């Protein structure tokens, strides 16, 4: 038949074996889907679950068919299993022919119209049909604790869009996880938010409590999930394996809580030995959180202090602490200041050193609030004091708000169990971290290659975290072209933070969503389009100095154009411009004829 409702497309009658099971699905696609949905089509035109691509019918086509289908590989009769191929194939040439339609989604944002989860729902009325029954330099950065405050619901809709390309390691994980927590006693009395993971994707009802789905044994092993659920997408739909994946690199450099999935995607050859290097990064990551959260758990703060908090707007007033907007050492000076009397068991230590601008404090929380006292002190209260000689006597602009963080990494408190987890990882199998670096994994702390074994190197991995800062520049050090990034979702979560840092270099791309917001650091898309590649100048090489030897001997006309304002207002000033130089001379006194007649005396100078 035909794809109806004001955007035409044809179906082939492929001569009466399709086009009498074509009413069996073109009058059910004549449901009510599409005949209360079209409507809303003249006045409010696209409005909702209609036509908003002229190929949007030829989607919920595709996707509804494959949604009352066989629905199982031992498939039911054809109108359920072949009549969707016959579609998918005239919907392949119809308007990808191949290019990776997530280029085409780009191609949905940009040539029609720019609803993203409109954009993203017919990619997942895309791929899931296509599976159904048949169809089958770079430089790598995970993330961690970054600018994100959920880390789940953004997995939650990445399982909801690409049930095809996860549902094996879902499988996998959370079975483990599953287990994990029965494997060593004492964590049993800590997950009273129960750890079956894959039950709060469907049920979301009786979800985790958001605040405690942010609390340390929930989200630290939960943060390798989403950066290899983002993997293994990059890796089966592009076709690859991670060990194809880990051929095309340069870099594989991640933050403190990814440097786990850095060492597990240098040690990554096939498939299979994917699940032992996933069994690599969660058999770590779910040691971590429980067992610095029994060398120190939540402090659960009195009210008077969550009043005053918010009153600052800081937000919830979780034992780590950002600032964003100063140079460096005053407020180091601060936490002198702080820790003049505090006890060093409530001291204040300064974690981490991502940004030259920015800095992350962490500590016990109250020290913390302590010292958001003296940042009160001597602060701008943003009001306007720059345009009163500001580079003398103004007081500076800052940004003093908590992170959503359970535990005071990077300090000198989670000392012990670091120490304990040490035989913790030797317990069980996992601990080999060999010489299969392929890639040379920066360290988050003199970025070296890693395999400097008499590390016995989950150990130094724990030993960066919880003892030591990061300082994110010098970690960087790239001679790269892109990077790709795995950081915990959003333009937010430190994908940005690294073009924050560097400029003049590569084009960052970030493996979280389809959206775009501009040319800074694209992403979404281009990890398989085609015949259009980016390239963010290196603003530095380009645009720099020169010399030459032109057509006629001149350059390009001796650099210094210079105008006063009194002392260019004569032919006194033309000599200097019948020396070698600009002048420009203007402004004096009679605008009528005055110079203007003299504009002449001084042509005829000059």
Known sequence: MDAYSTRPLTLSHGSLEHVLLVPTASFFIASQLQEQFNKILPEPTEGFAADDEPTTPAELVGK???????????????????????????????????????????????????????????????????????????????????????????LRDLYQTYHVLVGDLIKFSAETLSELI??????????TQGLNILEWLENPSNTPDKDYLLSIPISCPLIG?????????????????????????????????????????????????????????????FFIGVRCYEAYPNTSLPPSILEDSLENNEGVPSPMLSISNLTQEQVQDYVNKTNSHLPAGKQVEISLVNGAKNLVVSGPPQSLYGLNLTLR?????????????????????????????????????????????????????????????????????????LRVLSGS???????????????????????????????????????????????GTGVRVIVAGTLDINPDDDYGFKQEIFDVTSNGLKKNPNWLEEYHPKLIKNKSXXXXXXXXXXXXXXXXXXXXXXXXXXXXXXXXXXXXXXXXXXXXXXXXXX
């Not at 293994?232 to 991640?254: D, H, N």
């Not at 786990?260 to 240098?266: E, F, M, P, S, Y």
């Not at 979560?493 to 924050?500: A, F, K, Q, W």
Request: aromatic letters at 10%.
């Open 64 to 154: 509804f068919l494959g949604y009352v289908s066989s629905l199982v590989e031992p498939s039911k009769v054809g109108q359920f299993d072949q009549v969707l191929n016959l579609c998918l194939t005239e919907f392949e040439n119809c308007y990808l022919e191949g290019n990776d339609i997530h280029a085409l989604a780009a191609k949905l944002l940009q040539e029609n119209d720019t609803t993203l989860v409109k954009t993203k729902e017919l990619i997942k009325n895309y791929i899931t049909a296509r599976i159904m029954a048949k169809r089958p330099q770079l430089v790598a950065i995970f993330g961690g604790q970054g600018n994100t405050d959920d880390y789940f619901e953004e």
């Open 182 to 191: 029965r494997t060593t006693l004492d964590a049993e009395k800590v997950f």
């Open 225 to 285: 999930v989403i950066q290899l659920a983002h993997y293994v997408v990059t890796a089966k739909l592009l076709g690859f394996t991670p060990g194809e994946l880990r051929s095309y690199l340069k870099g594989a450099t991640g933050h403190s809580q990814g440097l786990v999935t850095a060492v597990a995607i240098a040690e990554t050859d096939s498939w299979e030995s994917f699940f032992v290097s996933v069994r690599k990064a969660i058999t770590v990551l």
């Open 377 to 449: 002190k001597a602060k701008a209260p943003s009001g306007l004091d720059q345009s009163r000689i500001p580079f003398s006597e103004r007081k500076l602009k800052f940004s003093n708000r908590f992170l959503p963080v359970a535990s005071p990494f990077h300090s000198h408190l989670l000392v012990p169990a670091s120490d304990l987890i040490n035989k913790d990882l030797v317990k069980n199998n996992v601990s080999f971290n060999a010489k299969d670096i392929q890639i040379p994994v920066y360290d988050t702390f003199d970025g070296s290659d």
């Open 457 to 503: 190197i989950s150990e130094r991995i724990v030993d960066c975290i919880i003892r030591l800062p990061v300082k994110w520049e010098t970690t960087t050090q790239f001679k790269a072209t892109h990077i790709l990034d795995f950081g915990p979702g959003g333009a937010s979560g430190l994908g940005v933070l690294t073009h924050r840092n560097k400029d």
